[PDB]
Design a protein around this ligand. Structure first.
Ligand code: DL5
Ligand code: K
Ligand code: MG
Ligand code: MG
Ligand code: MG
Length: 994
């Protein structure tokens, strides 16, 4: 039954056909279960199935490397008639890397969700119904509640379904709806229909919503909606329809691959076309394969040589360590490339209740009467530190710690807060936090008493369980609560009747403690207490009170105020009737004013500073709450979204205000406004969608069910640890300790990750360029091969593979978060940076062939051949006239190849130092800054000196120990690459941009 809110109670009972007193007949229950089903959502699919491994292979970089692994495998398997390993090793080790690259991927999010599921422990939901089976109320399974079921709820009960209220057994019924509507205060329910057409759940005050909590009172209702049809279920399907693209980092790596897939196709056809004349016609050789496609085969192999091969591992490595860093900061991350997405965020959309605030009422201000000199009235005002239900906090007077006990007025103020209270404080030892029992407004008073400690009770050696109501149990030993006068709307206050206990100080008679709305309570006061003494209510005194209450009610410190009073001479209890609550206001007269407490749903202490750090980084914060506008504006002014006296007007919109604007004017209002209040869960995603329409990477921070669709819509969703389950599943990042200052740390991380990522990409791609140039120059000049694929394989994975990993530990700049977020359209690799590594890449290729050629001609240790003999080494034969005094085996010597390899590994160690910064000289920013890099240089160089002197390795890498003087030549070739990059860096500093 949809829209049950807009229909009368008797109209709802007719829809299912069930008496209010009897209940559902088992015949009806059986029919109502086949026409509506079980009250539950589809099974939780937070299980990482083994089909989600293909998601790790959606990255085309891995796919390119996978494709390059397959086209490097086939040409060596069916050709050349050689089953050696040299051509076979690279095919499977690439495949061995990729399968291992996918391991960490499906293990990270698996380890993540196992920590997210740990956040909420199993507490099976139940429900209380009335049926024709038994007259007594029977507690049944929550899932077995059908629409049309007569359901009663009491204080503390979690509403099992979307229920239309029928009758409120108590005077008033308060319902906490923070997790669904973001409403900071509990709502009072009625039974009358709401004929509002465009009504939000917040306007539907005649129904109970599933998932919400009952604050106070009890009522009996009719279930109008169950299962996925409920307001929670509607959102579950709402986010199920919500679709998001790949993470900004993941899609930025993809476009780099599309650029690398082009040069892979470019050099594949370039080598194929330059050898024209030989191709496009069958020549002497290769008749088994028509067309002589031999030139195509060597072109494909050369294209594969351009792939950094080791790169898809060094990237995942960098993200992996950056993830556990956040884990140290109690931040759980779903996907690996989601650790960067917060580093390129332009707008952070945050929810209010539960996210920006603790969602726990806290008494922060509090005053009593100090002196009454007829015309002069002074007050004793106090401040209370805290922001949670925890008994942790001290009472201050004029920002100085005081003992509440030495104030007689405060002792009585506590006595009222402890006795006139139907709520308690409990310590959830499972979650390790303090939770409320009943109404938040009263629990705040309970917390206040525990913090005050008016009798100075030692509580040091008490467990957190019995600490929750320690100071309150001391007060409750003094007076005996005879009965309580429940809250009523016409009066807006409540009171309790108390008689002394244990005959202690029986000189005084019974008392009556009252609390309620200030103006209403004070109007019924005739006396004000000054410590222990009482004086009449004078005009000036009356004014001094109301002036402060009005001040605390608005402005700088907008609070929820509450006046506290006692009735020194209460009526005899036999002359009081507790049947009609309209008599209660009269009983609460001739009162004595004691004091007033100020409370609010306070912002988290880390929120204000975090917002400023985001602003300094150029990240605009925007509040999106379902709470009323007044509270929203007030919170914004405290955290720094708005100024103390800043004129908001159309920088803040409500649900209706925003829904009345045309679509064109709606998206333009999302770049101006920074506060949207009284907002449906639908609008939250729409605001995110609008910000994304201007190509802005926007984040979302929430905790409630109404935040779920927006948490999923954003590029990155951030869920609070003390939030709903659906919010946790809809997000990628989960703050485990609700620390808001973790976000700004995840921004610095994401900016440090991306910057370092550009570095070891440029570092690895430059090496492969040199290799391609080397292989090409060899085939161009007809020289002996300088580098064999087995050597380059070892290099790109080990020797310059892990120094690239050490580049992921480059120190963050000081100007890392004083600059705006990077541009979305801005590419990972630019045309300038392309030329930059292509220039040093070209040098590497020319240096490698030059090193080997040096050994053949001008090296004293070498044969000293001429250039013609070197370029015609294949025409060499025994006793060849043009090769006099030379063995043709000298062109297969391992010594010149060692030169080409030692010049390659050394030129990368120098390039590693240049890869420290992008535009900073080594003279300005010294190379001894990164100690992680230097360690990688030594280890890789250690292996290089290990790969020459060990003896078995030179026999498989075709190498030999280098000469003591020949090493000096290597340094005279490798070192200039520093000066090359230093030149490129020089015309970058204030010459490329200045
Ligand atoms: N309009 C109203 N309708 C119903 N109750 C009201 C009320 N206005 C105040 N109260 C009751 O007045 C107090 C101050 O209002 P506050 O928080 O400053 O709001 P204001 O700005 O002054 C008025 P606004 O809505 O036009 O903006 C409130 O405390 C309790 O009920 C409230 C309460 N509770 O959970 O909220 C619980 C409770 N018990 O016992 O559980 C008792 C209250 N009480 O007053 O006794
Ligand atoms: K997300
Ligand atoms: Mg290779
Ligand atoms: Mg919230
Ligand atoms: Mg108000």
């Amino acid at each position: 039954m949809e829209a049950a809110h807009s229909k009368s109670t008797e109209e709802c009972l007719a829809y299912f056909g069930v008496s209010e007193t009897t209940g559902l007949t088992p015949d009806q229950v059986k029919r109502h279960l086949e026409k509506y089903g079980h009250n539950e959502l589809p099974a939780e699919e937070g299980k990482s199935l083994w089909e989600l491994v293909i998601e790790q292979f959606e990255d085309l970089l891995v796919r390119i490397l996978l494709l390059a692994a397959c086209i490097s495998f086939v040409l060596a398997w069916f050709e050349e008639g050689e089953e050696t390993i040299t051509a076979f090793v690279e095919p499977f080790v690439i495949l061995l890397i990729l399968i291992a690259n996918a391991i960490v991927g499906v293990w990270q999010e698996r380890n993540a969700e196992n920590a997210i599921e740990a956040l909420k422990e199993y507490e099976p939901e139940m429900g209380k119904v009335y049926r024709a089976d038994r007259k007594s109320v029977q507690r049944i399974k929550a899932r077995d509640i059908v629409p049309g079921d007569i359901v009663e709820v009491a204080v503390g009960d979690k509403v099992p379904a979307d229920i239309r209220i029928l009758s409120i057994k108590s005077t008033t019924l308060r319902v906490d709806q923070s997790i669904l509507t973001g409403e900071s205060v509990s709502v009072i329910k009625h039974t009358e229909p709401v004929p509002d057409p465009r009504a939000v759940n917040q306007d539907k005050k005649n129904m109970l919503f599933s998932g919400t909590n009952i604050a106070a009172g009890k009522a009996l209702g009719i279930v109008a909606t169950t299962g996925v049809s409920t307001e929670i279920g509607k959102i579950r399907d709402q986010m199920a329809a919500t679709e998001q693209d790949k993470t900004p980092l993941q899609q930025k790596l993809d476009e780099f691959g599309e650029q690398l897939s082009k040069v892979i196709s470019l050099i594949c056809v370039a080598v194929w076309l330059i050898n024209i004349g030989h191709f496009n016609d069958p020549v002497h050789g290769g008749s088994w394969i028509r067309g002589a496609i031999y030139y195509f085969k060597i072109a494909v192999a050369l294209a594969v040589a351009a792939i950094p091969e080791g790169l898809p591992a060094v990237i995942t490595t960098c993200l992996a360590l950056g993830t556990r860093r956040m884990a140290k900061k109690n931040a759980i991350v779903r996907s690996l490339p989601s650790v960067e997405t917060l580093g390129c965020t332009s707008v952070i959309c945050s929810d209010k209740t539960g996210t920006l605030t603790t969602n726990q009422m806290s008494v922060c201000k509090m005053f009593i009467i100090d002196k009454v000199d007829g015309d002069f009235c002074s007050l004793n005002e106090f401040s209370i530190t805290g922001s949670t239900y925890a008994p942790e906090g001290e009472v201050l007077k004029n920002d100085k710690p005081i003992r509440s006990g030495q104030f007689d007025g405060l002792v009585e103020l506590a006595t009222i807060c402890a006795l006139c209270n139907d709520s308690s404080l409990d310590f959830n030892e499972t979650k390790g936090v303090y939770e409320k029992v009943g109404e938040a407004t009263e629990t705040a008073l309970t917390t206040l008493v525990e913090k005050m400690n008016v009798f100075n009770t030692e509580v040091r050696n008490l467990s957190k369980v019995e600490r929750a109501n320690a100071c309150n149990s001391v007060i409750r030993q003094l007076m005996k609560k005879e009965f309580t006068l429940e809250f009523s709307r016409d009066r807006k206050s409540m009171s309790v009747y108390c008689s002394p206990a244990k005959s202690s100080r029986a000189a005084v008679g019974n008392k009556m403690f009252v609390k309620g709305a200030p103006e209403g309570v004070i109007d019924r006061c005739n006396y004000v207490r000054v410590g222990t003494t009482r004086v009449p209510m004078t005009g000036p005194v009356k004014e001094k009170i109301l002036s402060v209450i009005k001040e605390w009610g608005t402005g700088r410190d907008t609070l929820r105020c509450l006046a506290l009073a006692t009735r020194d001479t209460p009526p005899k209890r036999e002359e009081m009737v507790l049947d009609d609550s309209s008599r209660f206001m009269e009983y609460e007269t001739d009162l004595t004013f004691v004091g007033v407490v100020g409370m609010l749903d306070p912002p988290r202490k880390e929120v204000m500073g975090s917002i400023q750090l985001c602003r300094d980084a150029g990240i605009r914060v925007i509040m999106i709450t379902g709470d009323n506008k007044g509270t929203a504006i007030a919170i914004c002014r405290r955290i720094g979204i708005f100024g103390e006296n800043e004129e908001v007007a159309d920088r803040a919109y409500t649900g209706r205000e925003f829904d009345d604007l045309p679509l064109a004017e709606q998206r333009e209002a999302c770049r101006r406004a920074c506060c949207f209040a009284r907002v449906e869960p639908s609008h939250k995603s729409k605001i995110v969608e609008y910000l994304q329409s201007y190509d802005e990477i926007t984040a979302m921070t929430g905790d409630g069910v109404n935040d779920a669709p927006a948490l999923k819509k954003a590029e990155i969703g951030i869920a609070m640890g003390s939030g709903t389950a659906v919010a946790k599943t809809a997000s990628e990042m989960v703050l485990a300790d609700d620390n808001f200052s973790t976000i700004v740390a995840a921004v610095e991380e994401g900016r440090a990750i991306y910057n370092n990522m550009k570095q070891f990409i440029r570092y690895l791609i430059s090496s492969n360029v040199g290799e391609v140039v080397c292989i090409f120059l060899t085939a161009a000049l007809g020289l002996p091969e300088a580098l064999i694929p087995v050597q380059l394989l070892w290099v790109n994975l080990v020797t310059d593979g892990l120094p690239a990993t050490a580049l992921g530990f480059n120190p963050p700049d000081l100007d890392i978060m004083d600059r705006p977020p990077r541009s979305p359209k801005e590419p990972l690799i630019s045309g300038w940076l392309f030329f930059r590594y292509m220039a040093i890449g070209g040098y590497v290729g020319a240096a490698t062939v030059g090193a080997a050629a040096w050994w053949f001609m001008y090296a004293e240790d070498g044969p000293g051949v001429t250039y013609h003999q070197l370029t015609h080494f294949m025409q060499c034969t025994e006793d060849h006239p043009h090769f006099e005094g030379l063995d043709c085996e000298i062109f297969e010597a391992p010594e010149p190849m060692t030169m080409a390899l030692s010049v390659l590994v050394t030129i990368e160690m120098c390039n590693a130092l240049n890869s420290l910064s992008e535009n900073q000289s080594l003279m300005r920013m010294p190379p001894w800054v990164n100690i992680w890099l230097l360690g990688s240089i030594c280890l890789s160089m250690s292996l290089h000196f290990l790969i020459l002197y060990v003896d078995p390795l030179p026999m498989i890498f075709k190498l030999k120990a280098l000469d003591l003087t020949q090493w000096l030549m290597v340094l005279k070739i490798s070192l200039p690459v520093i000066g090359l990059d230093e030149i490129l860096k020089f015309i970058a500093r204030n010459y490329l941009e200045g």
